[PDB]
Amino acid sequence: QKMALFFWQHGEEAMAKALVACKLCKAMAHEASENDMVDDISQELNHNSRDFG
Amino acid sequence: ASAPDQLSLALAWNRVDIARSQIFIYGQQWPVGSLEQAMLDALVLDRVDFVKLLIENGVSMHRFLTISRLEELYNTRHGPSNTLYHLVRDVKKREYLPPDYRISLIDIGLVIEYLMGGAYRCNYTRKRFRTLYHNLFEINHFPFPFHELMVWAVLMKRQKMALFFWQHGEEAMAKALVACKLCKAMAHEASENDMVDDISQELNHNSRDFGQLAVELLDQSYKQDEQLAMKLLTYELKNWSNATCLQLAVAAKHRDFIAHTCSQMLLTDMWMGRLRMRKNSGLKVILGILLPPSILSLEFKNK
Amino acid sequence: QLAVELLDQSYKQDEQLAMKLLTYELKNWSNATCLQLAVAAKHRDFIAHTCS
Amino acid sequence: CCCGRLIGQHVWSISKHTQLSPTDAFGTIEFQGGGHSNKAMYVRVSFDTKPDLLLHLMTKEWQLELPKLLISVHGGLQNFELQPKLKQVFGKGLIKAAMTTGAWIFTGGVNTGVIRHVGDALKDHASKICTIGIAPWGIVENQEDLIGRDVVRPYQTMSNPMSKLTVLNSMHSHFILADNGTTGKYGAEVKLRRQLEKHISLQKINTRIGQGVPVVALIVEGGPNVISIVLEYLRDTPPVPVVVCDGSGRASDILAFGHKYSEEGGLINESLRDQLLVTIQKTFTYTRTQAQHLFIILMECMKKKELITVFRMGHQDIDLAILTALLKGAN
Amino acid sequence: KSISNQVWKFQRYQLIMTFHERPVLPPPLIIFSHMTMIFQHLCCRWRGLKLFITDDELKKVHDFEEQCIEEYFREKDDRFNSSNDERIRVTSERVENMSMRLEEVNEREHSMKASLQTVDIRL
Amino acid sequence: GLKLFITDDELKKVHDFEEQCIEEYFREKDDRFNSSNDERIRVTSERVENMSMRLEEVNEREHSMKASLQTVDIRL
C-alpha cells in the first residue's frame, strides 16, 4: 500500500491510476468478501479504496 | 529499631520510597519470617506499591501463599470495605448467622460458583481440596499463586491490587474474563441487596475495566501471530473449571470479545467444519442434502 | 450547580454525615429541610443524585 | 596476602604458587532483588584456558545461537555519571542495535561504571539478546553463595558501600567468571576476553556477508588501558573497528578531540597538540613524563582512522554509528 | 440497530455450539443414531472447541502471553506519553523549571560580569 | 461527446499540469500536517526537552566559570 502511494506519486496519468486503483480495491474487496477470508482483509481493501478515492 | 520495626512504620505512612532508601538497603539483618508477616500486612492494608517493593526484594509469592494465610486475607476487616459479606450469608442459606464466622476456602468457593454460574465449579470445591482442608484444619502452597490472589482482590473490591496481580503471573486472558464475570455478578447481587448505587456502579465499572483489558489482550496477540492466538482461546483452562476463553466470555456476556475478528474466524472454521467452500455457500450446501451424489464435487480441507 | 456538587463531595466524604445534612431542621430558613427547599425550586438533579 | 585474601582463609605460579584444579562451581543464578527476577547462568573459567571449549559451551551446552554482531562494552572501571538523556539515547541505540542484529554484548559484569549504564540500558528494554559478562571471580561479592554444582543459587543485590567487592549486575542474561586464583585484583579477565573475541571472530557466519562473525567494540571514557585496548583493536588481524562516545570525558573525549583535528592521522598542528598534551597531563591528571608516551601511542592508534567512528549527539541514536562501523569493519 | 451487528456475533456462538452437539441423523431418523451411540458406549464400558494441549506446547502458548502482556502496557505508556493531554503537562512542568533556572543564570552572570569589570581594573 | 481525442503535444501540456497539481497537493498536505495542533505540540515538547538539557549544561559550566573567575581574582 505505501508502495502503491509511492508509485502513484511518480509517473503520469495519476488520476486514472487512482480511479482504476479505487475500482480494483473495491473489486478485490467484494471478491474477498465472496470467498470470505479474514474480514480484516475486506475492511483493509475498502479502506484502501477510500484512500485512493 | 530493627528493620522489621522500621518497615512497619513505612506501611503506616504509605511513604514507599523512604522504605526503598534506608529500610531496604544493603547489609540489613532481616529475620526469617519478617518479610513474610510484613507481606501479609501489605495486602490487608491495601498497599499496592508496598507489595511491589516486597516482591522486588524477593518475598517469594509461591512460598508466602498458604491456605491458613489466605484464610486471614479473606477475613481481613481493616482496609477498604468489602462486599463478600452479603455473598457468604446468602450461599450458606442456599446450602441449608454466627457473627464471627471465619469465611473458609470451601465457603468462598461456593461464592465463585454462585457468581460465575453455569457449570463453573471451583478448584476449592473439588473433592481433592476438601480432604486437604479437613486434614490441615508444598501441599498447602497453591501451585500457581497469582490466580488465587487476584480472585481475592476482585471479590473484596480491592481494584488497584487486582490489576497488579493480573499482570504478574500467567493465563492473563483467563484472569481478565473471570474477573469480568465476578464483578458483574457481584454488581447484580449488590444492586438487588440495597447497597448504595455507588457500590453497584463501581462493580459494573470494574466489570467493564476487566472486560476491556481482555479485548486488546486479544488484539495485540492477533497482531503478533494468528496461530498462537487461536491456541490461547481454545486450549483447556484447568485452573478455571476446565473451560475455554470463548466459554468464559459468553458466561460473562462480554459481547465485544466475541465480536473481535480472531474469534469470528474461529467460529466460522468450525461452522464450515472440514468443508472449505465459503465461496457463496448456502446454495451449494442445500444441494448437498437433496443430492447425495452432488457432495463429491464439494471441496474439503485435509488435516 | 453550586448546590448539587456541594451534595456530591459530601457523598464521597461521609455518607452518614451527608444524609443528616439534607434532613436536619433549618431554623433560619422557615423550619424546613434541604429536600423541601429543593422541591420548591424543582431542582431535579439534586433529588436524582444517589444520596437523596 | 599477595592474593588479597585473609591469612587463614586459604584452602599464575609467580608469587601465588597456584595449583591447577578441576572446576567446581557452575550453574544458574536466581536474581532476587533489583526489580524483576532474572535467571542467568554462570561458569567459572580459568584465565589461561583455550577459547574453543568456551565456544563449544556457548554453542551446545548453553543453547545460544551464533550472533551477527559482538558489541563490546569496554569502558572505565570506576563508577561515573553522565548526562541523563545521553544515557537514554545510548541505551536506546544499544538495545535497538542489539535487537536488530541479534548481538551478544560483552559488558564487564561487575556493577561499577559503564556496566551500570548497560544495566540501566536493559531496563529501558525490559522485555533474544544475550548479555554475557566477563568479570573476575575474585572481585565479585558473596562468592560463597555462588558455590554449587548445577544448583539454582540465590544471589541478592546485597552491595556493601565500604566493601571492596562488587556485586554483579542482576540483569545480564549470562556470566563468565574468570578465576586466576586471587581475590580483589583486576587483570584476570582481559586476555581471556580478547582470545574469546578472537576465536569468535574467526568463526564463519551462516550468511558470510563480511569476514565471518563481525565485532564492533564500543568505548565510553576509560583510562590508559582503554587506549591500549584501542591499539589492540585497530592494529589486529582482522582490524576490528571501534566506536567512541564523547561528551563523557576521560580517554573517549580525548580520542574524539584528536580525531576531529587529525586530518591524515599525524597532521595535527602544534597548538592543538600542546593543548591535547596539557589536557592529558592536567584535566585527566596523568603524569607529564608518560604524556609523550601516551601521545605516540595515540599516534599509533591514529594512523588507522578509517575504522575509528565517533558519535556526537545533537533522535540520532548510537545505532547509526554502530551499523556504520559494522559496514566499515567487514571488508 | 446500533448494537445489532455486535449482538449478531454473540448469537452466533450459541448457534454454532448447539448444532455441534447433535447426532448426525435427522430428528426423523434419530432412532438410528441413538442405537449406535448406545452400541459404541456399551461395547467399551461393559468390555470440537477444546484443544487438549500437551505440556510442551502449553509452555509456548503461556510464554507468548508474557510477551503480549508487555506490549500492552508499553503501548499504553506510549499512548499516554504522546497524547496531547500529557504533552502539555510535561511542557508546563519543564517551562516552570526553566523560569527559575534561567533566573539563576541571569543573576549569576550579572554578578560575574561585574566581577570581571573589577578584575579588569587590575590588568 | 465526452471523449476529447487530444494530440500528443496538448496531451504533454496536460501531463505537465497534472504533475504540477501532484506536487502542489503533496506540499499543501505537508503544510497542513506541519501547522496542525498535534505536530506543533510534539515539536515544541521535543525542543523544550533539548532546551532543558542544554540549559542544565549552561548552568553547570557557568558555575564552573564563576569559580574560575574567583580563582582569577585570587591571582590578581
- The DSSP annotation for D171-193 comes to T-SEEEEEE-S-SS-S-SSHHHH
∠D182-D185-D188 over CA atoms, to 5°? 75
Distance in Å, alpha carbon of B274 to nearest chain E alpha carbon? 12
Which residues in chain A have their CB less than 8 angstroms from residue B278's CB? 35-36
Beta bridge partners of C26: C32
Helix (H, G, I), strand (E, B) or coil at B226: coil
| Rounded distance between C-alpha atoms, residue D252 and residue D248, angstroms | 7
Sort D15 into a burial class: Cβ within 10 Å, 0-12 / 13-18 / 19+. Answer: exposed
Return the closest-CA partner of residue B150 out of B49, B15, B48, B38: B48
Q: Which residue's C-alpha cell is 508477616? A: B37
Question: One-letter amino acid identity for D142?
Answer: N
Segments in B65-104 forming alpha helices (H):
67-74, 84-95
Distance in Å, alpha carbon of C40 to nearest chain B alpha carbon? 26
Question: One-letter amino acid identity for D284?
Answer: F
Which residues in chain A have their CB less than 8 angstroms from residue F18's CB? 12-15
Distance in Å, alpha carbon of E104 to nearest chain F alpha carbon? 8
Chains D and E touch (3+ CB pairs under 8 A): yes
Q: Is the dihedral of CA F10, F14, F19, F23 positive or negative?
A: positive
Return the closest-CA partner of residue D115 out of D132, D129, D128: D132
Question: Please, what's the b/e burial string for C9-45 (b: 16 or more CB within 10 A of its CB; e: otherwise)?
Answer: ebbeeeeeebeeeeeeeeeeeeeeebeeebeeeeeee
Which residues in chain A have their CB less than 8 angstroms from residue F15's CB? 12-13
Distance in Å, alpha carbon of A32 to nearest chain B alpha carbon? 9
Q: Would strands D132-136 and D174-179 be described as parallel, antiparallel, or unpaired?
A: parallel
| Rounded distance between C-alpha atoms, residue D231 and residue D244, angstroms | 13
Q: Is the dihedral of CA B284, B289, B293, B298 positive or negative?
A: positive
- Which helix (H) or strand (E) is D105 found in, with range? strand D104-106
Beta bridge partners of D130: D104
Q: How far is CA D34 from CA B20, B26, B53, B134, E69, in A?
A: 11, 12, 10, 40, 21
Distance in Å, alpha carbon of D81 to nearest chain F alpha carbon? 14
| Rounded distance between C-alpha atoms, residue B107 and residue B26, angstroms | 44
Please answer yes or no on whether F55 and E95 come within 8 Å at the CB atom.
no
| Rounded distance between C-alpha atoms, residue D227 and residue D244, angstroms | 11
Q: Which residue's C-alpha cell is 469465611? A: B103
Greatest pairwise CA separation for chain E in angstroms: 120
CB B38 within 8 A of CB B11: yes
CB D119 within 8 A of CB D73: no
Neighbours of D64 (CB within 10 A): 17
Quote the crossing angle between the two packed helices D291-302 and D250-260, to the nearest 10°.
Answer: 60
Q: Which residue of F has its CA nearest to D247?
A: F57
Q: Which residue's C-alpha cell is 499504553? A: E76
**D69 phi and psi, to 5 degrees?**
-155, 150
Distance in Å, alpha carbon of F6 to nearest chain A alpha carbon? 14
Which residues in chain B have their CB less than 8 angstroms from residue D127's CB? none
Return the closest-CA partner of residue F16 out of A18, A16, A13, A8: A13
Distance in Å, alpha carbon of D33 to nearest chain B alpha carbon? 4
Sort D119 into a burial class: Cβ within 10 Å, 0-12 / 13-18 / 19+. Answer: buried
The residues of E whose Cβ lies within 8 A of any Cβ of B are 5-7, 9-10, 12-14, 16, 20, 48-53, 57-58, 60-62, 64-69, 71-73, 75
Q: Which residue's C-alpha cell is 578441576? A: D22
Return the closest-CA partner of residue B19 out of B57, B65, B61: B57
Q: Between chain D and chain F, how many beta carbons pairs sit less than 8 Å apart? A: 7
CB E81 within 8 A of CB E89: no
**B54 phi and psi, to 5 degrees?**
-70, -35
> Is F54 an 8 Å CB contact of chain E?
no
Distance in Å, alpha carbon of D270 to nearest chain E alpha carbon? 29
Q: Which residue's C-alpha cell is 560575574? A: E112
> In sequence order, which residues have a C-beta less than 8 Å from that of residue F49 and are 6 or more positions away?
D85, E94
Chains D and C touch (3+ CB pairs under 8 A): no
End-to-end CA distance of chain B: 69
DSSP state at residue D171: T
Q: How far is CA D147 from CA D25, D155, D169, in A?
A: 5, 11, 18
Segments in chain D forming alpha helices (H):
51-56, 84-101, 114-125, 190-201, 224-234, 250-260, 270-278, 291-302, 319-328
Helix (H, G, I), strand (E, B) or coil at D123: helix
| Rounded distance between C-alpha atoms, residue B172 and residue E107, angstroms | 57
Which residues in chain E have their CB less than 8 angstroms from residue F70's CB? 115
Chains F and B touch (3+ CB pairs under 8 A): no
Q: ω into residue D238 within 30 of 0, thus cis?
A: yes
Give the best residue of E3, E8, E10, E70 to mutate against chain B (max B CB count within 10 A): E10
Please answer yes or no on whether E87 and F63 come within 8 Å at the CB atom.
no
Q: Would strands D174-179 and D242-245 be described as parallel, antiparallel, or unpaired?
A: unpaired
Greatest pairwise CA separation for chain F in angstroms: 97
> In sequence order, which residues have a C-beta less than 8 Å from that of residue A49 and are 6 or more positions away?
A21, A22, A23, A25, A26, A29
Q: Which residue of B has its CA nearest to E58?
A: B235
Q: How far is CA D59 from CA B54, D179, F2, F30, F71, in A?
A: 37, 22, 73, 51, 60
What grid cell was written down for A1?
500500500
| Rounded distance between C-alpha atoms, residue B197 and residue B203, angstroms | 10
> In sequence order, which residues have a C-beta less than 8 Å from that of residue F11 and are 6 or more positions away?
none
| Rounded distance between C-alpha atoms, residue D51 and residue D63, angstroms | 17
CB E98 within 8 A of CB F55: yes
Please answer yes or no on whether E6 and B216 come within 8 Å at the CB atom.
no
**D136 phi and psi, to 5 degrees?**
-70, 150
DSSP state at residue D204: P
Quote the crossing angle between the two packed helices D319-328 and D84-101, to the nearest 10°.
Answer: 50
> In sequence order, which residues have a C-beta less than 8 Å from that of residue A9 and are 6 or more positions away?
F22, F26
What grid cell was written down for B177?
474474563
Count of helix runs (H) and strand runs (E) in chain C: 4, 0
> In sequence order, which residues have a C-beta less than 8 Å from that of residue D276 and are 6 or more positions away?
D254, D257, D258, D268, D295
Nearest-Å Rg of the Cα atoms of chain F is 29
What grid cell was written down for F40?
506543533
CB C35 within 8 A of CB C51: no
Per residue, the 3-state secondary structure of D22-55, as one string, reads CCCCEEEEEECCCCCCEEEEEEEEECCCCHHHHH
Please answer yes or no on whether A39 and B265 come within 8 Å at the CB atom.
yes
**D153 phi and psi, to 5 degrees?**
-90, 140
Return the closest-CA partner of residue D253 out of D88, D80, D124: D80
Helix (H, G, I), strand (E, B) or coil at E51: strand
Q: How far is CA B82 from CA B116, B190, C12, in A?
A: 18, 11, 17
What grid cell was written down for D298?
595515540
Residues comprising chain A, all counted: 53
Breaks after residues in chain E, judged by C–N over 2.5 Å: 47
Which residues in chain D have their CB less than 8 angstroms from residue E71's CB? 127
Query: Sheet of D215-219: strands edge to edge?
Result: D104-106, D70-72, D215-219, D242-245, D308-311
Segments in D15-167 forming alpha helices (H):
51-56, 84-101, 114-125
Pick left, alpha or beta for residue E78 (phi over 0 → left; psi -120 to 50 → alpha; otherwise beta).
alpha
What grid cell was written down for C30?
422557615
Which residues in chain F have their CB less than 8 angstroms from residue D85's CB? 49, 53
What grid cell was written down for D17?
604458587
Please answer yes or no on whether B58 and D161 come within 8 Å at the CB atom.
no
Return the closest-CA partner of residue D56 out of D46, D71, D66, D70: D66
> Is A9 an 8 Å CB contact of chain B?
no
Question: Please, what's the b/e burial string for B176-215 (b: 16 or more CB within 10 A of its CB; e: otherwise)?
Answer: bbbbbbbbbbbbebbbeeebeeebbebbbebbebbbebbb
| Rounded distance between C-alpha atoms, residue D181 and residue D143, angstroms | 13
Return the closest-CA partner of residue D49 out of D151, D193, D214, D236: D193
Please answer yes or no on whether E71 and D126 come within 8 Å at the CB atom.
no
Please answer yes or no on whether A38 and B280 come within 8 Å at the CB atom.
no
Please answer yes or no on whether E20 and B224 come within 8 Å at the CB atom.
no
| Rounded distance between C-alpha atoms, residue B41 and residue B29, angstroms | 20
What grid cell was written down for E108?
549569576
